[PDB]
Amino acid sequence: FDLEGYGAISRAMGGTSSSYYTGNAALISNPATLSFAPDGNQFELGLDVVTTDIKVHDSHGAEAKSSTYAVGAQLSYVAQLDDWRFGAGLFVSSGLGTEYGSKSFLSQTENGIQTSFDNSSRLIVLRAPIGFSYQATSKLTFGASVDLVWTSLNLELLLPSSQVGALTAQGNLSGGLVPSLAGFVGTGGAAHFSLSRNSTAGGAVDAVGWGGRLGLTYKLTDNTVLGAMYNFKTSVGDLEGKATLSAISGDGAVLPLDGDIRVKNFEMPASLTLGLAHQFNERWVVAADIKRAYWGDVMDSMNVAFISQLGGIDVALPHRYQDITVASIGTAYKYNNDLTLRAGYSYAQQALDSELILPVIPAYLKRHVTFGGEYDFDKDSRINLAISFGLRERVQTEMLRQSHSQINAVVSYSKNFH
Template identity: 45%
Template sequence: MQRCRYLPVALAGLCLAPQAQATNVFRFEGYGPVSRAMGGTAAAHDVGNAALMANPATLGLSPEGGQLELGLDLVVTDIEADNLATGEHAKSSRKDLASAYYAPQLSYVHRDGPLTWGAGVFAGAGLGTEYGRHSFLSRTPDGTSTGLENASRLLVLEVPAGVSYAVSDRLEVGASLEAVWTGINLDLLLGADQVSTLIGQNRVRGSLVPVLGGLPGLQGAHMSVSDSNDVRSGVDAWGWGGRLGATFRASESTRIGAYYTLKTRLDDLKGRARLTAVSSVAGQIPLTGNIRIIDFQLPDALTIGVAHQATERLLLAADLSRVRWKEAMKDIKVRYESDGGGDLDIRLPQDYRDINVLNLGAAYRIGRWTLRAGASFAGQAIPDDRLFAVVPATPTKHASVGFSYDLGKSGSVNVAYSHAFRETMTNRQLPNTSAPIRVEHAQDNLVVNYSYRF
């Protein structure tokens, strides 16, 4: 079990370092350069080995024989939080290629007649902010600068193994089962007004509540659940997930596809934490202990799509997904047990909404080149009054372009670029913010992939 604990660190060295800032809440808007360039469509056309992360039935659309793929995602984020009361700005520091998030991915698929199978390691989802120690987010409501960090990092590694089978020349079915590892780092300062509101809403319980409440001059409480290493996390856990899918060739030029993504089944995320009470009288009082984030899951989703070969060269595709965030992300539930005795049970309200996601894409082949473009439109899962500055998973609109160059029998080079248009949200309400805030989030993703066939 001790060895298993360090396995994700080794995997992360291959597939996620230091972290990935995802879109459409925590997930990427498409996996692999083919799907990403075509707006995230993947239900009814060949997207390469990334079918392991989408509709496993489309594995059967891959070429005969083996196909090894090695890819890299680069993500550059532009995130700012504004204090609407004072006009101050806090910037998250990932705005150039030198500090971009990057996510290598590795997979292998083999097709032998009607049977296709494969496995891979992918960056499944992520989130990252780095506001530092000296912005208004590190200041208590009475104006005291604490010098305490405000940051977040969510890593999700997925290790899928999938299979598809051609039931007939028109119907393909597929399934995948995956090991899922999730790790979280979180540094968050809550002002005294936020703490008292959570207590008043019965969202904080435990023997440490009267201790905090009785501390003279309490100004806030800071929770640090983090590891400074780029790939390790403050709390982590293993679990599993999977997908079921099918495609049906309705005509010579049109294919319909559908797949269902299961809700993950993760154990509680466990690790060490430091709770720091901030007092105007006693200063900063740190307490170390064990922490669990309880029942943190990624949601189930149903996707249906169609791909139409409009001409010999032009392929058109559209997918529609329903993602059930409401059940998966109602509260962030935390249990903290101090080394010195005492505990806290905290429920941070999130109240995410179920969302619809529409993906549109096109591909045009010219000789050895295939040119692609697409767009993605999603509903906003996060209510304004539940927004945390350190959890700005807000972009909903993306545009993408890309291309492939066929190298012949040896494979192809594939590239995609997508832009998440700036999304702005405002939260003026306790308990998830003390000062009224406006958060703006835009980002750029570049995906490069080499596919080797043999």
């Protein structure tokens, strides 16, 4: 979602972030970094663009071709008040997700009828940090940040009867409606969710949250820095909106019901990263961070409740223990006095599998490989660059094979106010 450091610049160097100037994006990173910022007041201005490519194939020529793009932004201004550095920003990750069309084997009944229903998802995060960085000694900086959050989810899932069957079997599905139209669907049917309503005026199924953050740094040597930060599991609230469940019979008939979803305990990971920035040269600077996503850490259940005039349906997915580890290294050579060149590789590696291959919910990529530079044309104006690579992956276990990749591409601009 954003466990990739973030920063037009912190993206260029493998996602590294913990101990070196990473731009104003250190507000959602390590706010202690903001103390390595030029004097006066930096004003960052970022524009993100991701595209994503998913191929799903199984039981012969299953042909699910998704290929969306998303687009984010960055409006930030970190201001220096002596040893204090105050700052705030707006950050966007809008359009992220999937779209398969209503032509897919994903849009065929469990018995195999081509439905007109769509398979697609799209999320919109809206972080808004208020942060500070505090210079303390000639060797140690500290920073915190707190952010209001706002998420918006539209999605068009379809579940071939047997999946629903498995969900009732597990004890995860329930509700008035399950008995009632079990026979209308019938083994060989399918139910289909559609929370659309992107008109936020409607319901949209959206929520407000609160993230947190704080970190530090140590100049162990004069040519070596020592970063650490703990992102808090962001307390997202309930996603309440308006959706439309639609059961589908063996021969292709459709009952459209209209109600309200309430998604509960969408667990976001707390994370703790550590690393360093050795500088054995006045061009060659190199960063290396390890990150540990404190993932599954509460013993709740994500609870999706659909309530209609005709009764409720309800799904409860437990919070399995889980966690990931992103080893990220990055590099920035100074070709000249106006030019830095960055590159980075990073390898995430999660444990305990959790291989619930959800086509409409893409999975985090392990190997990333990123490049990028910087260029000055004003010295009080400045402009950063990055591109990263989601490296080819296979994941598969109903039987389903999926193979997908991602490709981020950022820009930002800092007009400095001395």
